[PDB]
Recover the amino acids of this structure.
RNA sequence: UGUAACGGUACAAGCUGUAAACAAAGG
RNA sequence: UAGAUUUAUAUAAACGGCAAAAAAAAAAAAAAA
RNA sequence: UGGGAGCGAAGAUAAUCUAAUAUGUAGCUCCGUUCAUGGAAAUCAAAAGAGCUUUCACUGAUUGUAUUUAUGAAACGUGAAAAAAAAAAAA
RNA sequence: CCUUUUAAUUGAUUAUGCUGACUUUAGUCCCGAUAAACUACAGUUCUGCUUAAACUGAGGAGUCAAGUAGGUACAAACCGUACAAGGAUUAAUU
RNA sequence: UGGUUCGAAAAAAAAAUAAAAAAAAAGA
RNA sequence: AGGUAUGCAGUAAAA
RNA sequence: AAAGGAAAGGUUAACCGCUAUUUAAACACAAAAAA
RNA sequence: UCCUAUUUCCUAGUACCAUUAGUGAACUCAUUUGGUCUGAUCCUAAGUACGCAGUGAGCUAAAUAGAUACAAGGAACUUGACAAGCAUUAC
RNA sequence: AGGAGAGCGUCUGUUGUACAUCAACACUAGAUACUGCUAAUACCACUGUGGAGGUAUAGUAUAUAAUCCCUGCCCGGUGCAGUAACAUGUAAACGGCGGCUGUUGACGGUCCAAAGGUAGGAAAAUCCUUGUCGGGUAAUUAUCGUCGUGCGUGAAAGUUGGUCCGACUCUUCACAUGUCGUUUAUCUAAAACUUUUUGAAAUAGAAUUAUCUUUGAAUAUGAGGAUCGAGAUGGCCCGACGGUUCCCUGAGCACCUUUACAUCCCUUAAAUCAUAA
């Protein structure tokens, strides 16, 4: 829990090889958010991928740079 | 600890549909009733006043109707008696029931006195015959009677299964394109003629397709339901008044025996 | 402890208790429970707020900074 | 403590035992306000 | 403890069936509220016995007794006629509060004793300057409910409300305006004044629950001015969420009346409001059970014997049609009883006239039957068939419904008694005809 | 089952609870 | 137990009345006249006065022994389960006990107010109802009809539903020869027939009786179990001597009432259970033997391997339990004339 | 263990009815011992003495003994 | 009396009570 | 001592039979505190 | 409350063990401490005398009780502290 | 300083001593069940298991726990989140 | 939709809670 | 086979 | 056969209890004392 | 004048408190990925008209836990057929 | 977990969670004993509660147990019953049921005793290094049957049996068989090795810690003599009496037994008022 009263720290004292990533569930959630934004005309994924100080209007990118 | 109830019942019932079907069987067909047939008749005394009075005033009838043997009693209503019996017959029945009650009340409290015993005996025998003409051996429930008359048999239930009407005459705004088997029951205890039973389609059956999804292939009484059960020329108005030792079925005509009927 | 007010849990509330626990927060009563699970409300018990006509009122929340000078001079002229 | 014993026990403040000791933050010889 | 296996199974099945029965039972209780309100701030703090001798009663006591009896549904004819006698004796000594409570009791119980209202109205008119909001509202409300029409006194009450506008309660003013509209007692100047005051009352003093009571189609059609109509129709779109089926029904009827009789106002509305009412027209507005009256059934029987197919008591649009013929759908009939007119007169009510005009302009060919004329036929069927045939052989009625001849309370009472006798005879000889009476027992 | 079964007040006769309407 | 009606209603050492009267007449004098008339009518109807003996009981039983439509149609019941007999042929009612004449049984499970176990080896068993049986037969000089016979889970005998001539319903102990339709009465003028209740002073010697009152009007207490009965030996003006089922001879006041006949269900002792489960249903728990425990738990316990008792038999509490008498020596015998001896001595002498 | 494992239960009803404020009051224990979340009788000093520079018009010492209307 | 719960205050082991740090200049 | 000052802390004991629920018809009904 | 009242143990000593000691202690309930306890002789003593009650020192670890272990601020008495008897028959 | 005194309870390699810190074992044991790609001109990797309908007149067949366990930037933060009339009649505005 | 509330049935009392604040002249 | 929609008392019967 | 629910509420009946009681909400409607 | 009566009756806006309405032991416990897999039930299912879930990289030594396949012999093993084996094999 | 059999318990059940799932406990039933009702017995505030709102076909106590045939002798002892006390009774009440000799001895002698162990099992869960004879085997300290040879057992503290049953102890036949002579090949890993991520433990007086032979608190890495180039890593456990959780005794403790002693409670025996007649 957030108040750190449980005993969940006991297992973390032992090594484990890896952990499940739940990518199917997380991608479904992310795409739901993306659809909610996109129905209103927002490209959340593009915004998240933009470089610092980079401006791209519409659905444009390196390919637009190449062909323009 | 919890106080959740109603729709939040904490009881973990089974979801198995087969088990729930068995539960339905146990809850309806095998349900136990404490009351008796006379208990039901008394509960409906206000509507069956004459027969209640006869049962309570005619010696022996109550004893006969309170016996353990599973019985079926067809109870006529005061309305049925008034509608179907002639005025003189109704007057005679009322007078004789009142006479028996008056003699009973006298007990509570020459030749002229001697004739009273003969009149009492005659009235008691006649009214006992009349009342016991409606008592039938065995417990015949409504669905059993319908299935015996053939309703529910795919080979015989024709004319009762696909009733339809001229829909555009009654729901026109939805039809613009159109705007352009006798079973026999054992004889009554006081007679030897077995009782005929049959079924018919009610006037409400034809209107089902107007308001229900259907899968068809290629005066009138106002009683409810889709099927009408007739017993000895009398319609069942309220059925399955179950008891501990039988069942009571409400009917709209009295089943007068031939002996008590007048030939001319 | 694992139950009770310890570890910052504080006093018990219906949110933290099982269904059946009854604890409000201090609201006034406005009616009567019936014998069949209902509650008859009486609007006569609703508190009556007394609000004057605020329209066309020259008063304001604060006071202008010059009022201090004006009042101080008007009082010093009397004191002296 | 379970219901049967609770139904026969009495509350601590139903007697005078609460006032017959001098336990306090400063020790065991409390001098009450107003002496 | 333990149970025998058969007993275990039977009781377990009973428990399951009880659970399912509860679930099925609660299915349709969408509008069942565990929290419920009851009004009690009109109950007086004094105690009274309703059966006490009237000769010991004063105005303050008799008014409280009448109101208490109305609240308790103690509708006893002897008790209320004693009330009437004592109140008429005490007419000289009643305050506006006492008269208001008396009128409330009479109207709420729907005790249709015209003589008491007639005898109490002059004192109401004389004492109007001292009346207050509740008393004015109650007098108008009771008169409207019981159909006792006195246009002069109703107009005087409305004028008194206007004069006391700064003291009137908003709900009382709304009810007074609605009653005035329903009784047709406001000439154009009074209607304009009432509309002007109601506009400000609704805009400044009424929230949604108070405003929704102002939505009455009769007032919208016959009384309200154009700005008031526009404001009301616009505000209903905002206040719909708090409304009930009756409010929705009256709003729909108001919209239809405006569309049919005031197309200019309908167009002066905005597109969003018009869209709201168009979408309202698509909803299933819960009505309440209606059935043909005895007079309606008699007319239907005579019509069927004449040989005209027809249907009874059905809903078209936002209207209820008494009789609608099948072969020619545009032909319809209305059977008009004693309560469709004002007491002791053949003058139609404002709602009846409005419905007649709207249906006529929408295309229906309406014919009407008057109980005052029907009752004179008696139990004869040939006479009734000839009556209906002769009515059929004549043109439909105009879009404007005109009132009938003059009448009196004496004739009204005589006709009501005759209708009672005819009802009795017809029911008797219907049920006797139904009864076969063919089983003869040789019991004697 | 009944913690207070043996008490002197258990299932006592009378009382204001049950004697509401008794004069 | 005491979980039913309170002490104030249940406890009364001296009963001041023996006739529970329910007069119908407006005044006390007319009530007395009616009571006299009813007594005279009972006397007139009474004809049998000879004793009711074992042999007469056997003759009546022999006489009683010598002397497809009725079902729920279309009702296929359980796959295997079926009642032993249909309702119209079963000896007992096959129905349910009257709700107005019974209540739920408070199961103490062998534990007293302290919560400790005082009666050992008791189990929950099947749910039971206590039914209110009239041990007093308070109503006198009024005839009643036996309508049906009923099972009782708390009692070894059968019950009978008695409907008095005025419609009152009650439950009484049924006699071995009690059948539906029997007429019964309680009175001093009653005939000597099974089921009738009379004072012990009006019952001839050699008669067989049951449900005997220790104190007049306090309800029968002696001889209740199924098949049990007592015999009238001798009579004097004030006392009547009875031989009881235990072979005890005891005197009873002549005013104590009793019922003629043997207690019904004499075949109870012939029942065979067949398995531990039947006793489990009946409400029993396993009985561990004293010598199977450790020495701290029973006097007979202890010892490597199995052993004998190692001493004369004693109970858990150190009391000899084979031949040792336990009745208080100083307690007076009172009306007891002679109390039985050991069964071995009885059968060998 | 046998079958499904069962250990000490966390039951709010039981804990609050057996070890709560009122249950602790009904218990027979040493009530002079300090309890953070329950009844105890380790009494405090009350409001301390006023420092010489504070305002006596605002210094406060009593709540219940002087409670007026 | 003592203590505490919430609330306000620098979201606090301090202060404090919905007037929650301050009225001292009233017919 | 200018005003204000929520809630809990089971209180008719500023008081008197004991005895559950600060104090409960008589009796059943019982006591080293 | 090592003060006063009620009930009232065992571990420990007796080289086991009993009495006795521990101890009239611990726990439990009740008083609430100089404005208190108690108290102005049907007292104690010797053939002389003392003079309510209370505290301290000595007499003395004496005479005692326990009879293997120990317990014992004994009585009278001596030197001191404090000192008190009793407003008061009504008005 | 010296001197005299001190009742300091005054000297610790050791009580499987107590409270702690820090080494050796030793860089030793310990790493739970199935995984890939995201592209220089279209797409549908493979596997384990199958209640994944969410208005169709019906609160969508439970209880209990999380003293707020699936909100939110590759966050073990800050902030936000349980509406019984479900509020957007928002087929609106543009 | 449940709790609350009546019943089961409970001082068998969930500290900071209530249909639960001195309890009808209530000013309609 | 707990209690369902003006609500407090109150008797009987019962799928 | 091992012998199994009835308190409160709803229904029906009975009823000389009572604002501790259904809007000062509304719809519908040949409808009703005495004389 | 042949319906058992042809009997006015929609939803008064609605106190206080609980709820994340799904997969899932989701509890006690703790080597606690909440969620997959490990079992019945819950949708007339070509697994429910694309659902839920998938954890660093290498590397032919033996030993170990298992899986499969063992010529001919067939309990000669062992305290003991323990453990194994059969319960598949033209179609 | 099949076919054919034996032992113990009849059986289905209970059962020591975390060394005992059994032949141990319970069980349907046959008995015995007590108890007349404010019953006995239990709880031990006792005018109270369970028993039981039951009444000798009931309740309580103690054995033995379901089905068939049987269940021998003893009242001398102890207990109990009986009576004023005796007499006497009661063993399915607790318990007991011979020795030395003549004719292999039917049949005698003699002592003792209350009776002298009967019927029926029988080399047994009793006796015992593998008793005689027979079946199974190449070989039978096993198993089954048999003898009654030896030691013996033994009759409701029950004897002998029929059928069925058991995560019980055993004998035998069959099966494909890696259980075995005797091991091998391929594949996977909660198996191992390297690496990345990351990191304990028990133990440790100090150590720069060799092999032979001897000595020694008596079996030495360290003492005498002789000999001898050593570190880490992987593996294996010969040693380091390798590391960490069985026997005797005390002027110690705890629980159990009763013809050990003392005390206490109860039941008797009494006493004492209430109490006057």
């Amino acid at each position: 829990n957030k108040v750190r009263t449980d005993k969940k720290e006991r297992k973390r004292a032992f090594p484990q090889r890896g952990f499940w990533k739940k990518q199917n569930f997380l991608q479904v959630k992310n795409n739901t958010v993306r659809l909610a934004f996109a129905v209103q005309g927002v490209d959340l994924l593009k915004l998240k991928r933009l470089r610092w100080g980079e401006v791209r209007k519409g659905n444009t990118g390196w390919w637009t740079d190449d062909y323009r | 600890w919890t106080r959740a109830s109603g729709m939040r019942n904490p009881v973990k019932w089974t979801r198995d549909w087969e088990v729930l079907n068995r539960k339905v069987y146990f809850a309806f067909d095998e349900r136990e009733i404490r009351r008796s047939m006379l208990d039901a008749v008394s509960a409906h005394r206000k509507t069956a006043s004459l027969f209640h009075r006869m049962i309570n005033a005619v010696p022996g009838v109550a004893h006969a109707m309170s016996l353990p043997g599973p019985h079926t009693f067809f109870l006529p209503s005061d309305k049925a008696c008034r509608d179907h019996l002639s005025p003189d017959s109704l007057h005679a029945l009322t007078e004789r029931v009142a006479f028996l009650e008056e003699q009973q009340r006298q007990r509570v409290g020459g030749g002229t006195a001697a004739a009273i015993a003969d009149r009492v005996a005659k009235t008691t025998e006649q009214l006992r015959t009349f009342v016991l003409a409606h008592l039938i051996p065995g417990e015949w429930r409504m669905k059993t009677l319908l299935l015996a008359c053939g309703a529910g048999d795919p080979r015989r239930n024709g004319s009762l299964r696909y009733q339809d009407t001229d829909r555009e005459l009654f729901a026109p705004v939805m039809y613009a394109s159109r705007l352009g088997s006798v079973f026999l029951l054992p004889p009554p205890q006081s007679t030897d003629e077995p009782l005929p039973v049959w079924v018919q389609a009610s006037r409400y059956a034809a209107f089902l397709p107007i308001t229900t999804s259907t899968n068809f292939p290629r005066r009138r009484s106002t009683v409810g339901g889709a099927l009408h059960l007739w017993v000895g020329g009398a319609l069942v108005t309220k059925g399955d008044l179950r008891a501990h030792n039988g069942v009571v079925h409400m009917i709209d005509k009295p089943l007068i025996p031939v002996q008590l009927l007048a030939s001319p | 402890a694992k139950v009770g007010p310890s570890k910052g849990r504080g006093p018990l509330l219906a949110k933290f208790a099982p269904v059946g626990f009854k604890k409000g927060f201090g609201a006034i009563g406005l009616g009567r429970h019936t014998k069949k699970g209902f509650f008859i409300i009486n609007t006569m018990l609703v508190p009556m707020f007394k609000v004057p006509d605020l329209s066309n009122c020259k008063l304001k929340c604060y006071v202008a900074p010059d009022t201090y000078r004006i009042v101080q001079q008007s009082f010093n002229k009397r004191e002296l | 403590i379970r219901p049967r014993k609770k139904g026969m026990r009495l509350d601590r403040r139903r007697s005078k035992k609460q006032y017959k000791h001098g336990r306090h933050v400063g020790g065991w010889n409390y001098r009450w306000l107003g002496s | 403890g333990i149970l025998r296996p058969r007993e275990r199974l039977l009781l377990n099945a009973l428990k399951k069936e009880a659970d399912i029965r509860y679930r099925g039972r609660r299915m349709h209780k969408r509008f069942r509220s565990w929290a419920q309100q009851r009004v009690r701030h009109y109950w007086l703090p004094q105690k009274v016995c309703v059966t006490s001798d009237p000769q010991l009663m004063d105005g303050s006591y008799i008014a409280a007794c009448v109101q208490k009896a109305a609240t308790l549904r103690k509708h006893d004819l002897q008790l209320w006629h004693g009330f009437s006698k004592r109140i008429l004796e005490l007419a000289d000594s009643l305050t506006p509060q006492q008269m208001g409570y008396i009128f409330y009791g009479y109207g709420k119980s729907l005790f249709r004793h015209e003589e008491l209202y007639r005898g109490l109205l002059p004192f109401v008119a004389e004492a109007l300057p001292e009346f207050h909001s509740h008393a004015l509202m109650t007098v108008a409300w009771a008169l409207e409910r019981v159909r006792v029409n006195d246009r002069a006194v109703v107009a005087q009450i409305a004028e008194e409300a206007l004069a006391k506008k700064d003291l009137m309660r908003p709900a009382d003013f709304i009810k007074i305006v609605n009653c005035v509209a329903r009784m047709g007692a406001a000439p154009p100047s009074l209607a304009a004044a009432l509309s002007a005051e109601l506009m400000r009352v609704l805009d400044e003093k009424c929230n949604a629950l108070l405003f929704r009571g102002a939505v009455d189609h009769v007032a919208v059609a016959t009384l309200y001015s154009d700005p008031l109509r526009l404001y009301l129709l616009e505000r209903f779109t905002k206040t719909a969420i708090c409304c009930r089926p009756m409010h929705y029904q009256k709003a729909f009827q108001s919209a239809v009346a405006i569309r049919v009789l005031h197309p200019p106002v309908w167009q002066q509305l905005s597109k969003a409001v018009r869209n709201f009412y168009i979408r309202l027209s698509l909803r299933r507005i819960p009505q309440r059970a209606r059935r043909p009256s005895p007079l309606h059934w008699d007319v239907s029987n005579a019509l069927a014997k004449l040989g005209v197919f027809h249907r009874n008591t059905f809903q078209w649009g936002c209207f209820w049609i008494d009789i609608g013929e099948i072969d020619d759908r545009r032909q319809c009939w209305f059977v008009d009883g004693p309560s469709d007119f004002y007491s002791s007169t053949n003058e139609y009510t404002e709602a009846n006239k409005l419905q007649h005009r709207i249906l006529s302009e929408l295309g229906w060919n309406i014919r009407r039957v008057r109980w005052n004329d029907w009752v004179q036929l008696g139990t004869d069927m040939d006479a009734k068939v000839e009556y209906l045939r002769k009515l059929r052989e004549r043109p439909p009625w105009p879009a404007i419904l005109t009132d009938g001849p003059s009448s009196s309370r004496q004739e009204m009472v005589a006709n009501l008694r005759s209708a009672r006798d005819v009802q009795r005879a017809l029911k008797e000889r219907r049920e006797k005809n139904r009864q076969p009476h063919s089983l003869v027992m040789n019991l004697g | 089952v009944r913690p207070n079964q043996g008490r002197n007040d258990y299932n006592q006769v009378g009382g204001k609870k049950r004697g509401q309407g008794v004069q | 137990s005491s979980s039913y009606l309170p002490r104030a209603a249940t406890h009364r050492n001296r009963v001041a009345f023996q006739l529970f009267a329910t007069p119908r007449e407006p005044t006390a004098s007319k009530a007395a006249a009616a009571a006299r008339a009813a007594a005279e009518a009972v006397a007139r109807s009474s004809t049998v006065s000879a004793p009711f003996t074992v042999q007469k009981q056997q003759r009546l039983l022999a006489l009683l022994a010598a002397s497809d439509l009725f079902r729920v149609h279309g009702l296929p019941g359980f796959s295997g389960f079926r009642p032993s007999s249909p309702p119209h042929l079963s000896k007992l009612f096959r129905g349910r006990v009257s709700r107005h004449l019974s209540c739920r049984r408070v199961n103490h499970l062998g534990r007293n107010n302290s919560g400790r176990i005082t009666v050992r080896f008791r189990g929950a068993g099947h749910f039971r109802r206590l039914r209110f049986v009239d041990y007093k037969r308070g109503r006198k000089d009024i005839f009643g009809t036996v309508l049906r016979l009923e099972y009782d889970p708390n009692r070894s005998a059968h019950l009978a539903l008695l409907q008095y001539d005025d419609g009152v319903l009650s439950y009484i102990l049924a006699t071995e020869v009690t059948r539906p339709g029997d007429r019964v009465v309680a009175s001093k003028h009653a005939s000597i027939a099974p089921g009738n209740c009379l004072p012990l002073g009006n019952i001839p010697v050699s008669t067989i009786v049951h449900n005997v009152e220790l104190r007049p009007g306090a309800g029968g207490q002696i001889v209740r179990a199924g098949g049990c009965y007592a015999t009238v030996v001798a009579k004097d003006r004030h006392f009547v001597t009875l031989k009881l089922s235990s072979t005890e001879v005891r005197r009873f006041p002549a005013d104590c009432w009793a019922t003629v006949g043997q207690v019904s269900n004499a075949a109870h002792a012939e029942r065979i259970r067949g398995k531990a489960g039947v006793s489990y249903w009946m409400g029993e728990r396993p009985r561990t033997r004293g010598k199977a425990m450790n020495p701290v738990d029973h006097p007979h316990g202890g010892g490597t391997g199995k052993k004998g008792l190692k001493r004369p038999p004693v109970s858990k509490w150190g009391i000899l339990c084979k031949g040792y008498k336990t009745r208080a020596k100083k307690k007076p015998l009172g009306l007891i004339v002679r109390r039985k001896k050991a069964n071995k001595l009885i059968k060998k002498f | 263990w046998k079958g499904n494992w069962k250990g000490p239960q966390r039951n709010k009803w039981k804990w609050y009815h057996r070890h709560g404020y009122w249950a602790t009051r009904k218990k027979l224990i040493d009530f002079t011992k300090y309890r953070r979340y329950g009844y105890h009788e380790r009494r405090g000093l009350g409001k301390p003495r006023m420092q010489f520079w504070e305002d006596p018009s605002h210094h406060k010492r009593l709540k219940k003994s002087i409670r007026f209307w």
Observations:
- Helices of chain D lie at 3-6.
- Chain D is about 10% helix and 0% strand.
- Residues 23 and 30 of chain D are 6 Å apart (CA to CA).
- The first helix of chain D runs from residue 3 to 6.
